[PDB]
Amino acid sequence: MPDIFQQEARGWLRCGAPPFAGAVAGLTTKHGGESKGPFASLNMGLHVGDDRTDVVNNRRRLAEWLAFPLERWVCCEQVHGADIQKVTKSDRGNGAQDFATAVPGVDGLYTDEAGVLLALCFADCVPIYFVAPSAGLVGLAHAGWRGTAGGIAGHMVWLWQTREHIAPSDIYVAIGPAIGPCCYTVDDRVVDSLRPTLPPESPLPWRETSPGQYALDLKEANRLQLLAAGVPNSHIYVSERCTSCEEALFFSHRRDRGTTGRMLAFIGRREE
Numbered sequence: 001m002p003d004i005f006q007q008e009a010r011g012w013l014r015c016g017a018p019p020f021a022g023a024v025a026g027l028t029t030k031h032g033g034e035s036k037g038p039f040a041s042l043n044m045g046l047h048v049g050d051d052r053t054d055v056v057n058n059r060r061r062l063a064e065w066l067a068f069p070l071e072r073w074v075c076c077e078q079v080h081g082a083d084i085q086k087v088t089k090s091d092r093g094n095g096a097q098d099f100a101t102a103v104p105g106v107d108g109l110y111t112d113e114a115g116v117l118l119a120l121c122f123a124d125c126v127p128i129y130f131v132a133p134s135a136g137l138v139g140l141a142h143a144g145w146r147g148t149a150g151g152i153a154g155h156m157v158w159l160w161q162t163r164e165h166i167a168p169s170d171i172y173v174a175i176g177p178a179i180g181p182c183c184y185t186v187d188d189r190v191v192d193s194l195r196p197t198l199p200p201e202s203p204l205p206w207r208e209t210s211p212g213q214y215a216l217d218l219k220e221a222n223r224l225q226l227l228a229a230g231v232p233n234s235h236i237y238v239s240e241r242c243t244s245c246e247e248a249l250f251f252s253h254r255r256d257r258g259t260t261g262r263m264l265a266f267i268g269r270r271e272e
């Protein structure tokens, strides 16, 4: 059946899961920008060595398609850890045009205010979108193998539960386009770091393909952690799109051999 992320009029995929209908949520594709060479053309990342003018114009292009001004975006450092920070209108603009002013040392953000667009960069790692429609909360986390080993997904649920007094049953999640087991192979150190994060009897999100080599499914790993954290199975939507496989739409750190652009994952609510 249809992927939860479907292409819109311009260069971006909207999250089609029902629980997200009340927000502006999606992932950009690589087309429609000003960037050149390995970054062609809609590179949204300011920290990958691309021309800054080109990247800021690409972000202005998206702000235009979304009718959500760049001055209202909030970005974070993305250090491949599991920390998350709550943001408000007072953080608007952080890391929007200058990477150095991004929220430091975290890999996830959440807000319960409208008019704030959470914006994170990806090119293979897992983008995890969160929403509590009733309470008006939205969240976004960046999960590579290190952040997943650190439990970033469950940490978001924990924070919403303990600090925002939201029940896991009131949370919905969408796991967007990322590299699949079809293209992502890792060794024992990687999978060993994930083991402790899953329930004792849980099915493993990997498959040994050769002695010491594993086809890893990070999307599934995060899905299992979210289930354990209390998020209902039917509230979790998962994209089947692989960033490495779908070269016509995405930049891929692995497929492009380390030098490439970044798509922007975003989520926010329009301020009347």
Ligand SMILES: [Zn+2]
Pocket: 179, 180, 181, 182, 183, 184, 242, 243, 244, 245
């Ligand atoms: Zn693939």
